[PDB]
Structures are given as C-alpha cells and as structure tokens.
Design a protein around this ligand. Structure first.
Ligand SMILES: C[C@](N)(CO)C(=O)OP(=O)(O)OC[C@H]1O[C@@H](n2cnc3c(N)ncnc32)[C@H](O)[C@@H]1O
Ligand SMILES: [Cl-]
Ligand SMILES: [Cl-]
Ligand SMILES: [Cl-]
Ligand SMILES: [Cl-]
Ligand SMILES: [Cl-]
Ligand SMILES: [Cl-]
Length: 896
C-alpha cells in the first residue's frame, strides 16, 4: 500500500471557513429540486420533549449548523437561532386526508433541513425535510437518526465527545491527503482506465421521484448473506452483481458503468460520530465476464474491490477528467447503487421513533438509485427512480425481474440452479403474455400449389376480368389458356421440375401469363428488370443458372444473351400451343420464385409461404372479386408477389399500369380513376406522389380506393390522413418485412397517427410469422428493449439464398430459445406494450431525426426538404426533392 498523512485536529478555527467537499461542490453548482425527505407516523408525540431533542442535536452536531457562504465556502455557526418546528393541526378536520395529501430550500439560510409536525386525530406525523448537501446517506442514518432517537427518549441523555470536527476532515483530504502517497498511486489506476470505461446503462426512454421497494426479513437476510459468502462475496457485491444482470436485460448495450459510492471515513479516531459528506462515487465497470451468473457476478465483484482499494481519489475528480476526455453529457452516471451495508452498527434505529409513511431521496443527475440499507435486522432494497427518465414499465418491470433473480438465489444452493445458469429471462409476465398472445399465429397452409389455385379460379369464374393492361384486357379463361400455352411449350423444351425460367420483361399483361405458365410447367420464375444495364441482366441469369427466358417480343433483340440460353417472346412465340391443362409436378415446399437483392444475393421462396400470405391478406381485408388492384411495383421487386398471386387466386382484377421509370402519378391517378381501382400496393413515397397529384385535382380520382398498403420504407407521419382525405372510408395499412420474409410479413392498420410518434409503428405479425426482438445472443428482450428483429417461421421464410448456403446458414438461424428457424433481418426495433414493434432502422446507431425535422430526411453516418435553424426547438443542406431509389423508398445511400 502507501500510508496516508495523519489527521491534524485543530479545535480553534471552527468558525473560520473550510472548502466544500467534491461531492458537495458538485451539488452547490447544480442549483441555478435536490432535497431528501422522510415521514414517520406515531400515535402520540411530545413536542416539548421533541423540540428539546432537536435543539440538542443542533447544539451538539456542528453539521446541523453549517451554512454555505455565498463565496462558495462553508463555515460553522455557533448561535444559529431556535430550531424551527412547524405544527399543522388537522384533527377535527374532515378531509384531513385531503389537506394532508398536498405536500412538497437554500444553504445561505440556516436550517438546511425542514422540521414539521402534523396532528391528525389519534396519530401524529413527523415530517423531516433535509438537504442533500448537508451531510450524506450514512451521516443521516448513523448519526442524525441514531441520536434523534436517543435524544427524543431522553433529551438530556449522555452524548459522545465530539473530537476532531468535520472542518478538519475536509481541510484534511483537500490539502493533506490529496496529492500524496496513496493518492498519486490511485490517480494512476483511474487515469489508466478512463479510456476503457463504458458509458452509463443505456435504458429505454419515451421521448419527481417514484419508488419500488421490498423488505428482506431477518431469516431471508441471513440466507442472502450466506449465499453471497459461498461465492466469497459481500452482500453488497452479490446485489450490485444481480442488479447488474437485471440492467443488461433492458440495457441498449451490455457494458456500462455504475456509480457505487462508498462512505469511507478513513478509520480516523472519533470520526464515526461527526456528521458530514463522506461520499466517494466509485465508477464500477460492468462488463460481462463469465459464462454464468455466478461467474459474471464474481468477476465484476473483483473489479469493484480493486476499484475500492484505490478509493482515496474521489470519483468526482474521475467524473470530471472523464468529461475532459469525452463529452460532458457522455459522462454522467445516473444509475447508482447506494449501499450502507458494512458500516458500523449505529447506536439507535429510526424505526424506534416511528413507522415510516413516506421518504423520497430526490438526488440530482440521478435517474435510478438502488439503495441497499439495513434497518432493524432486515435488508431494505429500494429503487428511487426519476419518473419519466424511462419508458413505461421499464423500471417497474426490471424490478420484477430483479426480485425474481434474488428470489431464485435464496432458493438455489450455490453451484446449482440459477447460479450456474448462463442467463436469466428478464421479460416480465406481461412482456411474455403480450408477446405470446400477439405471436400466436399458427395456421395450417393447405398443400395446394400456387398456379393450381389460379387455374381453379379461372374455371370457377372464367368471364372475370383477370388482367387489364395497356387498354388491352384479358379474361381469366384467356389468361388461363395462354399460361397453359406457355406452360406446355416450356415443359416440352424440357423445363424439368425446379428449373428457373427467367421472366425478363417490362410491365405488361404478358408477365402474368409468363409467371403462371412457368409455375404450371413445373418451374420457378426469376424476374430480372428489363431496364438494368445490358451486362447486368445476363449476369444475374448466368449466376443463377437459368436457361430458358420468357420475354416480350418488343425489346427481345435488345437482350445480349448467349446461345446456351433459349429466348421466347410471349406475345407471339407461343400462340400455336396446347391450351390443355398441365398437371402439377412440383411440391408446395418447392420454389415458386427467386427474387434478387455488399454483393447481391438471390432469395429462393417456396410455394407454401406465398400461399400463406395470399390467404391471409384475403381473410384480413375481405378480398372480394369486386376488388381491382393497381399492380404498380415491379415484378423483380418483392412487393409484387401479392399483385401476382393475390387477386387472381380468389377472383379479383389486376390492373397493370403504363410502364414507367420516373414515378408518373398523373397516369396513376388516371388509371386509378378510370379502372375503378380499390387496392393500392406500393412504397410510401409513391402513394404520396399519387396523393400529391390527387389533392390538386377538382375530381376525386382516388375515391374508389378502399385499401392502401404502404411498406418497404418509412410511411410518413402525415401520409395516412392525406390519403384518408380522398375517399372517406379508405382503411390505411402499413407493412414491411425483408424480401426474405415473403412480401408482407406484418401489418399495422394506420387508423390514427399519433402526433408525438417518431415513426409509424411496424406491426403485429401476420399468419405463421413470429417477430421476436433479440439481443446479440438471439434471446427475446422485454418491452422497449432495443434489438434486432428475428422473424421466426417454418413456412413463412424464404428457403434460403439461391446457391450460397453460407449466407443462408448465417442469416437463417435456429433461435436458441426454442429451435424455431428464424431470419436475422438486420433491422433494429423494440417491442411496444400493445404488442407492436417499432422499427428503429438498420445499423443506424452511431437516430430519431425527422422526430426533430418533421416536428425532411435523417442524417448520415443532415438533409431537409429556411434559416440557420439548427436546434430549432432543441450542415443542414436543404434540397428541392429527395432522391428516390430504384423501386421508390428514400435513397439514403446516395445522400452522402
Ligand atoms: C419486403 C419489402 N417490405 C417489400 O414488401 C422490402 O422492402 O423488400 P426489401 O427492401 O428488398 O428487403 C430487405 C429490407 O427491407 C427493409 N424494409 C422493409 N420495410 C421497411 C419499413 N417499413 N421500414 C424500414 N425498413 C424496411 C428492411 O429494413 C429489410 O432489411
Ligand atoms: Cl397518507
Ligand atoms: Cl484489490
Ligand atoms: Cl489491485
Ligand atoms: Cl415512469
Ligand atoms: Cl391522422
Ligand atoms: Cl431498392
């Protein structure tokens, strides 16, 4: 070690100033609330006897007489006044319980505290206010309350000799001890860590103090200690370590720092009788070190003791140097564990004086304060948390978790049970009920093929308008026939079961026949865009191993393809064919399509899953054959798979639009007006453009819309209402999911946009899908907790990535929870308390921008669409229009 200078007690300079301690100084600058409070009920109080005791206390303890000179220093007083106790009298008052309800200071003015007595009929309520600057947690419980009990019992009773008054101790640490033997070798320890220190726990926010607590009885207190010992741990070390596990539950990162203050008086003779601020924040580093709870708790506990062996540097100095190194705001420690365990047994317990009825330490720059403190043989576990520091339920839920962790520790002999269990599930009972309830989406998908359902309908209603395309219409029978024509032809050219027939073409009726024939032939269509570069279209086909290519006659020659790949037009090269039905040869778990998306990978998608989506949307939004869908997404965009297999499988009418490149909302408002369209499906920016052009027209062109499904990007906050403007009765619905999740994998009826939402929600999960939110260990999190979205399903997930079975084996994992095969979407979100998911973006944590902007795009790893208004209500680069991507959406990569 390195011995510390002796304390030099000079009882003469008591009045003359001494400087503020570091803990206290940091408070005396935050004021420009902060004041603890207690309240004990007792049957009958003797104010006379009471008042004397409080005069004695003030007489005796110079700390109850110290004031803060406005110069920043503090001096004792000697003739302070008389103690101001304030009696309120509410005994014959009915609604005494009302006037008593309404309840709740300066170091320049003398009483740093606040005495009160309220006289209800038959019982009395002593109310002690007190200031967080005037003394500390241990001075309060071991000196102030211990003597207030003695002094109330006998105001004249014997009181200890006040050797070496606190002004020296402060003048000692500030001058004599700071700088020397131990302190130099301890400022090394922290300076050699302030770069490895993780930030404070990052819990969920929701963009006064409240209190959960429990009383561990004597019999359970003993066991709690025995359990901590069996691991070579002190109760405070077991509980810090449990509290550390519970926090990782919600924490937005597993490594964080806990302000764990020690109340060390440095073994000084007589000091354990002087009232003052012995507070030293230790910055404990919580990194998870260990495979089990014991292993991690034991490990962290060690780093706490090393952080303790080097205490003579006051944390307020570490906290200040941490702000030097980093930001200031990136250095607060608003999660603290305040343990009074292992201090000396105080003469008297405040419980003797009266039973508590209230108390709330209103610390400043503290959102959560876990207080471990013993009272009359019991351990009082207490969580004072600044209300609204945390999203709803987060703290109340973590307390449930914590109580259960501790619960198990008392239940589980060490080395068994929870102690050697790799993690603990922190999701509360509600967390789980609501998640199961919400994700009980299991429904048999009958093994009917996709084409065999459309055929089935064309024989059911053959006069029906199947496709309507470029004026040139198409009945179900005619489209069924031409598919057969195409189906049979291909199978004759040997399109064996499972082969991939590219459908390289531009928006036309010929696409609906090309797909439904490739399926009947026994294959699986590979859409590629007929607007990609001349070298890309052939590149995707060679990489996928696709021979036959169905195409339109126009721009057949504009297709530099090899000879080993046959090419048929589909508006002509097919008409002398057999309109006689093909017999399905493929199974329902075989591929219906391969849609393509740093290198580009291709998504194999089976029949069953598409079959599942289709017959849910239809049951979700009664899809009658009356409905007429404007099939606007491209066939190489995942968004199309409903337009292909949705309406036709039940009797409705696809309504192809005029091929486009730049979004042409003039034409669409027309085609929607003309063909009486009732079903809109596309990315939100296109259904916005369409609402733009529709609002600026005397007619009601979009008025036949009964249903609009925006998905695939950010559905803007105003958009559900601007559309719901035109055509009252339109029901809006937003969606999404990766192209690896078969078009739409979850739905959120947008009936009513909350103003204070950063984003529209994402959804509840559709049929046969489950949306988990997992930590980095693929474990479900509790509500509000930030995670990656793992979409679990046997029939709702893509089969895999076309050829590469590594990016498949990596992104389609087996969740350790349950065995469910699930897709790691690489999108981050958090569960909501109605069961929904909020979508936070994807690897965007360096993100709520349009949060500020709308109340205009986001930043980048800023762009709006006019003053120097940075932080307007808290590099901007305005732009006329924001740049769309290929399919719509908002091209965040092009922006920087
Ligand atoms: C499947 C689809 N939603 C269209 O229905 C889609 O976008 O296909 P994808 O873009 O090729 O698939 C991968 C990614 O899609 C992103 N995404 C879809 N919807 C989103 C919403 N509403 N908000 C944010 N991102 C969204 C995913 O993030 C996914 O990796
Ligand atoms: Cl009350
Ligand atoms: Cl040590
Ligand atoms: Cl050490
Ligand atoms: Cl709250
Ligand atoms: Cl609205
Ligand atoms: Cl895109």
């Amino acid at each position: 070690a390195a011995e510390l200078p002796p304390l030099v007690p000079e009882p003469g300079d008591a009045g003359q100033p001494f400087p503020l301690t570091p803990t206290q100084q940091a408070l005396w600058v935050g004021r420009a609330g902060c004041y603890g409070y207690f309240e004990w009920e007792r049957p009958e109080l003797d104010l006379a006897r009471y008042r004397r005791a409080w005069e004695r206390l003030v007489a005796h303890h110079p700390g109850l007489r110290t004031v803060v000179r406005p110069d920043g220093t503090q001096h004792v007083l000697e003739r302070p006044g008389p103690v101001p106790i304030t009696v309120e009298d509410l005994r014959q008052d009915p609604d005494a319980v009302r006037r008593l309800e309404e309840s709740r200071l300066d170091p320049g003015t003398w009483p740093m505290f606040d005495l009160r007595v309220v006289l209800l009929s038959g019982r009395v309520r002593v109310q002690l206010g007190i200031d967080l600057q005037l003394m500390d947690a241990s001075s309060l419980f071991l000196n102030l309350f211990s003597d207030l009990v003695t002094l109330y019992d006998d105001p004249d009773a014997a009181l200890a000799s006040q050797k070496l008054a606190f002004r020296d101790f402060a003048r000692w640490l500030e001058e004599d001890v700071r700088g020397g033997a131990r302190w130099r070798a301890d400022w090394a320890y922290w300076q050699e860590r302030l770069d490895g220190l993780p930030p404070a726990p990052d819990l969920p926010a929701a963009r006064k103090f409240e209190r959960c607590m429990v009383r561990c009885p004597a019999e359970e207190f003993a066991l709690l200690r025995e359990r901590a010992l069996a691991h070579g741990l002190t109760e405070t070390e077991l509980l810090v370590g449990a509290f550390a596990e519970v926090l990782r539950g919600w924490s937005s990162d597993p490594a964080f720092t806990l302000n764990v203050p020690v109340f060390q008086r440095f073994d000084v003779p007589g000091i354990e009788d002087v009232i003052g601020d012995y507070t030293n924040p230790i910055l404990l580093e919580a990194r998870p070190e260990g495979r089990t709870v014991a292993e991690r708790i034991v490990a962290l506990a060690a780093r706490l003791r090393a952080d303790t062996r080097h205490a003579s540097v006051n944390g307020v100095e570490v906290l200040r140097e941490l702000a030097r190194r980093r930001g200031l705001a990136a250095a607060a420690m608003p999660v603290v564990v305040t343990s009074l365990l292992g201090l000396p047994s105080a003469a008297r317990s405040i419980t003797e004086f009266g039973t508590e009825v209230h108390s709330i330490t209103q610390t400043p720059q503290v959102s959560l304060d876990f207080q471990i403190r013993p009272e009359d043989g019991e351990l009082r576990l207490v969580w004072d948390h600044r209300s609204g520091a945390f999203a709803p339920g987060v703290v109340e839920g973590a307390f449930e978790a914590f109580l259960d962790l501790v619960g198990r520790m008392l239940a589980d002999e060490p080395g068994h049970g929870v102690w050697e269990a790799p993690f603990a599930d922190m999701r509360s009972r509600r967390d789980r009920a609501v998640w199961n309830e919400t994700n009980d989406t299991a429904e048999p998908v009958p093994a009917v093929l996709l084409q065999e359902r459309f055929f089935a309908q064309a024989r059911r209603t053959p006069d029906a308008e199947a496709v309507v395309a470029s004026g040139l219409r198409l009945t179900y029978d005619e489209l069924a026939r031409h598919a057969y024509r195409i189906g049979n032809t291909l199978r004759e050219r040997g399109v064996r079961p499972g082969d991939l027939v590219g459908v390289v073409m531009e928006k036309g009726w010929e696409q609906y026949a090309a797909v439904y024939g490739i399926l009947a032939a026994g294959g699986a269509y590979l859409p590629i865009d007929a607007a990609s570069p001349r070298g890309r279209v052939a590149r995707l086909l060679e990489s996928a191993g696709a021979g036959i290519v169905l195409t339109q006659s126009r721009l057949r020659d504009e297709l530099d393809l090899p000879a080993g790949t046959t090419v048929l037009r589909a508006d002509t090269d097919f008409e002398t064919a057999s309109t006689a039905p093909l017999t399905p040869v493929q199974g329902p778990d075989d591929p219906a399509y391969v849609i393509y998306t740093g290198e580009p990978k291709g998504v194999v998608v089976a029949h069953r899953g598409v079959a599942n989506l289709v017959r849910d949307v239809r049951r979700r939004f009664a899809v009658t054959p009356a409905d007429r869908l404007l099939a606007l997404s491209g066939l190489h965009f995942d968004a199309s798979v409903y337009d292909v297999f949705g309406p036709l499988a039940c009797g409705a009418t696809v309504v192809v639009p005029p091929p486009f490149r730049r979004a042409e909302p003039d034409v669409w408002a027309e085609l929607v007006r003309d063909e009486r369209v009732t079903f809109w499906n596309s990315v939100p920016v296109l259904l916005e453009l369409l609402v733009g052009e529709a609002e600026s027209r005397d007619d009601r062109p979009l008025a036949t819309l009964r249903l609009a499904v925006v998905s695939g990007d950010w559905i803007p906050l105003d958009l559900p209402g601007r559309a719901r403007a035109q055509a009252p009765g339109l029901r809006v619905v937003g969606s999404g999911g990766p192209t690896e999740t078969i078009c739409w994998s979850l739905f959120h009826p947008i009936d009513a946009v909350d103003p204070q939402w950063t984003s529209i929600p994402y959804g509840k999960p559709i049929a046969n899908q489950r949306y988990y939110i997992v930590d980095r260990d693929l474990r479900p999190r509790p509500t509000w907790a930030r995670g990656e979205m793992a979409v679990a399903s046997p029939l709702g997930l893509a089969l895999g990535y076309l050829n590469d079975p590594e990016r498949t084996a990596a992104k389609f994992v087996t969740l350790p929870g349950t065995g469910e095969r699930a897709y790691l979407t690489g999108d981050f979100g958090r569960l909501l308390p109605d069961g929904g998911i909020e979508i936070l973006g994807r690897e965007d944590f360096q993100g709520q921008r349009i949060e500020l902007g709308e109340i205009g795009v986001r930043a980048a790893v800023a762009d709006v669409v006019l003053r120097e208004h940075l932080s307007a209500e808290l590099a901007i680069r305005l732009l006329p229009e924001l740049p769309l991507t290929a399919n719509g959406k908002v091209d965040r990569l092009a922006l920087a």
